[PDB]
Amino acid sequence: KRQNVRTLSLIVCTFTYLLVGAAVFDALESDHEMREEEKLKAEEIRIKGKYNISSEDYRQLELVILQSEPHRAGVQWKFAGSFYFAITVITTIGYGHAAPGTDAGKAFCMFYAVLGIPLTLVMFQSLGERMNTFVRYLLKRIKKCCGMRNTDVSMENMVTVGFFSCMGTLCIGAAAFSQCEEWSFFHAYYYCFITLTTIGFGDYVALQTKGALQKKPLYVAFSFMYILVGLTVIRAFLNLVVLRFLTMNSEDERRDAE
Amino acid sequence: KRQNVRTLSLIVCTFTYLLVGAAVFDALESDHEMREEEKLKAEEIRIKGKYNISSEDYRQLELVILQSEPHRAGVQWKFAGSFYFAITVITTIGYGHAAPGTDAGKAFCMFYAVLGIPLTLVMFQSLGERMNTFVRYLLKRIKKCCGMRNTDVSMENMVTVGFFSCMGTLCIGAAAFSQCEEWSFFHAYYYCFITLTTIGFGDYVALQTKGALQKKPLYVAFSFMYILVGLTVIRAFLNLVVLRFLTMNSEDERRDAE
Ligand SMILES: CC(C)CCC[C@@H](C)[C@H]1CC[C@H]2[C@@H]3CC=C4C[C@@H](OC(=O)CCC(=O)O)CC[C@]4(C)[C@H]3CC[C@]12C
Ligand SMILES: CC(C)CCC[C@@H](C)[C@H]1CC[C@H]2[C@@H]3CC=C4C[C@@H](OC(=O)CCC(=O)O)CC[C@]4(C)[C@H]3CC[C@]12C
Ligand SMILES: CC(C)CCC[C@@H](C)[C@H]1CC[C@H]2[C@@H]3CC=C4C[C@@H](OC(=O)CCC(=O)O)CC[C@]4(C)[C@H]3CC[C@]12C
Ligand SMILES: CC(C)CCC[C@@H](C)[C@H]1CC[C@H]2[C@@H]3CC=C4C[C@@H](OC(=O)CCC(=O)O)CC[C@]4(C)[C@H]3CC[C@]12C
Ligand SMILES: CC(C)CCC[C@@H](C)[C@H]1CC[C@H]2[C@@H]3CC=C4C[C@@H](OC(=O)CCC(=O)O)CC[C@]4(C)[C@H]3CC[C@]12C
Ligand SMILES: CC(C)CCC[C@@H](C)[C@H]1CC[C@H]2[C@@H]3CC=C4C[C@@H](OC(=O)CCC(=O)O)CC[C@]4(C)[C@H]3CC[C@]12C
Ligand SMILES: [K+]
Ligand SMILES: [K+]
Ligand SMILES: [K+]
């Protein structure tokens, strides 16, 4: 039974959390959307009237301008941008700054992700375990060197070091990207958070503001290795925190054989 | 040691898989991109020359048309669209069809995701365990009713039923969305795959082709419950397959105390 009371509690929690989220996002964003849509509609009418642009030409121009936006960021599918795409696929960040235009590319993206996502999960899990083991050794050595009465490393110490490793990773990212992309520090930090949680809205995407995929190989290398290292650190902390809970239903189901 | 040979093998595998992906995506997509960019640049020059649009006006018109695209899909931040956004946040699908425009909305999106992602992972893990337990009971009852010499349910049977549950979920989604959105069956299937893996490029997004968030409450309800159920089924199968491997490094590290 207890497994069922737990799962029903988690479902009621998730739907309550969605309702609270929806109400707060509505409260924060709904007036800004309306004022922005009134401003955009006014400027649209202004320009369309100035040049007397025909409705069919304006529709075609909208289609052209929307489809041209992936191409303004330079060549996406040559090797560097194909590698950037593959990273966003198998990590499931999926910015969608470019996404495959052909049906063959779509089918390959599916078969590629089918094997790439498991491989990447097992890889980040193994690197996270190695990282946490190194941290626990290094903390034990520090505690011994500090002469503490016990060298033992408790879960609260691991959670403290995990939290400051995540904050440090996001601050280092925010500094690098706010320098390289000319974002504000807050927007670069938001970009780093949305990337390393793998949400990946793609409102902000690095390497796109110029021909940087072609022209800045060292910044491309940084962006790729920052993504892979940051995802490792964030997942290692997430696993450290939630692993006690992910296994409860199966532990109770095994004990229920008694 | 064996833990280290495993993690180094997984890193070399991941980078080889990225190189193979990048080379194949380049081979598939790079000629289509160039032919499309030549067509778009030609149509841009055509329209800009027909109306003699000034360069500054064309830049402003591009900005207007790009920022107007979220608003063409109807009101995003009223309750139904705020709920759709919150779903894409805490599941980490993150289509980015709408993303918070204010800095307050960005900060809340961060604090909201910090708690929402763990909660949702623990919820899908618990529902997946309950689902797999139900399946294993139901298969045992079927085998007993079929009069088989043993009622035991092997891992190959669970993997077979998991695979056909995932294929069935994607086919049901592809049929519903190809009917409701006027996509082809292949594009609706690609959309379902990219959604339930949580990649979420957002090239295809349901509920956006008209005022459907406001005008079609029953299709909004279907889309939300399809997302939550599909993510449950897909994660339950992924866990079933990879759980033997996710725990190897910690099992070896525990046994290494001997
Ligand atoms: C830490 C260990 C275990 C792995 C280290 C791997 C890195 C040294 C590799 C992984 C991916 C590589 C990058 C993959 C792609 C590119 C793009 C490449 O630029 C181009 O190819 C230009 C575009 C073109 O001509 O197609 C320059 C090298 C670079 C940055 C590579 C630099 C070296 C990187 C970062
Ligand atoms: C979800 C379905 C459709 C696909 C599931 C694929 C996984 C089950 C595969 C994909 C990549 C595989 C991994 C790729 C490489 C390795 C390293 C390999 O390491 C060694 O053999 C090192 C020597 C040793 O450990 O003794 C062990 C298996 C493992 C973890 C594999 C285990 C099985 C994985 C996770
Ligand atoms: C504080 C310590 C303990 C950890 C963090 C160290 C940082 C200060 C380092 C780590 C990696 C470094 C980055 C590695 C690569 C690049 C790309 C580089 O890009 C260019 O030079 C652009 C031109 C080109 O790529 O050709 C600019 C510096 C930067 C961001 C570096 C800035 C300093 C960083 C963030
Ligand atoms: C299976 C059990 C455990 C949970 C079942 C939950 C569903 C019955 C709920 C969850 C989310 C609900 C939806 C959340 C939001 C909306 C939008 C709402 O439309 C509007 O509010 C219009 C826009 C506006 O006026 O703000 C209509 C109901 C609907 C589809 C809800 C229908 C009922 C749903 C699918
Ligand atoms: C990553 C950091 C920043 C945040 C980590 C948050 C998690 C540790 C929290 C978020 C939601 C929590 C869950 C919300 C609800 C429940 C149901 C609750 O169920 C009951 O109490 C039912 C009665 C019983 O089981 O006896 C058990 C704890 C649990 C799984 C919680 C465990 C801890 C969770 C996963
Ligand atoms: C094959 C069996 C074992 C499992 C799958 C059953 C399907 C045939 C059902 C399950 C849920 C159904 C869907 C639930 C809700 C809707 C929304 C509904 O939308 C409208 O009617 C639009 C107008 C409005 O919403 O007001 C159209 C039917 C549809 C897609 C249904 C089509 C048939 C579906 C996919
Ligand atoms: K996206
Ligand atoms: K994701
Ligand atoms: K995503």
Numbering used by the authors:
A (entry chain B), B (entry chain A): 2 to 259
Quote what the paper states about this structure.
TASK-1 and TASK-3 are pH-sensitive Two-Pore Domain (K2P/KCNK) K+ channels. Two-Pore Domain K+ (K2P) channels are a structurally distinct subset of K+ channels where each gene encodes a subunit with two pore-forming domains that co-assemble as a dimer to create a single pseudotetrameric K+-selective pore which spans the cell membrane. Here, we resolve structures for both human TASK-1 and TASK-3 by cryoEM, as well as for a recurrent TASK-3 variant (G236R) associated with KCNK9 Imprinting Syndrome (formerly referred to as Birk-Barel Syndrome). Overall, our results provide further insight into the structure of both TASK-1 and TASK-3 channels and demonstrate that the X-gating mechanism is a highly conserved structural gating motif within the TASK channel family that, like many other K+ channels, also exhibits a degree of allosteric coupling between the lower gate and the filter gate.
KIS is primarily characterized by LoF mutations in the maternal copy of the gene, with the majority of patients possessing a single G236R mutation. However, the most frequent mutation associated with this disorder is G236R on the M4 helix that results in significantly reduced channel activity. We therefore used a similar approach to determine the structure of the G236R mutant channel to 2.5 Å resolution. Overall, the structure of this mutant channel was very similar to WT TASK-3, but with the mutant arginine side-chain from each monomer directly facing into the inner cavity to line the pore. Intriguingly, it has also previously been shown in mutagenesis studies that introduction of a negative charge into this position (G236D) produces an activatory effect, and so it is likely that these positive charges directly interfere with the movement of K+ to reduce permeation through the channel thereby explaining the loss of function phenotype associated with this mutation. In addition, these two arginine residues are in relatively close proximity to each other within the inner cavity and we observed small changes in the local environment of the X-gate. This movement causes the M4 helices to move apart in a direction similar to that seen in simulations of pore-opening in TASK-1 mutant channels, and so may provide insight into the mechanisms which allow the aperture within the X-gate to expand during channel opening. The positively charged lining of the pore in the recurrent disease-causing G236R TASK-3 mutant also provides a clear structural explanation for the loss of function phenotype associated with this mutation in KCNK9 Imprinting Syndrome, and when combined with more structural information for WT TASK-3 now provides a robust structural framework for the development of activators against TASK-3 and other disease-associated mutations.
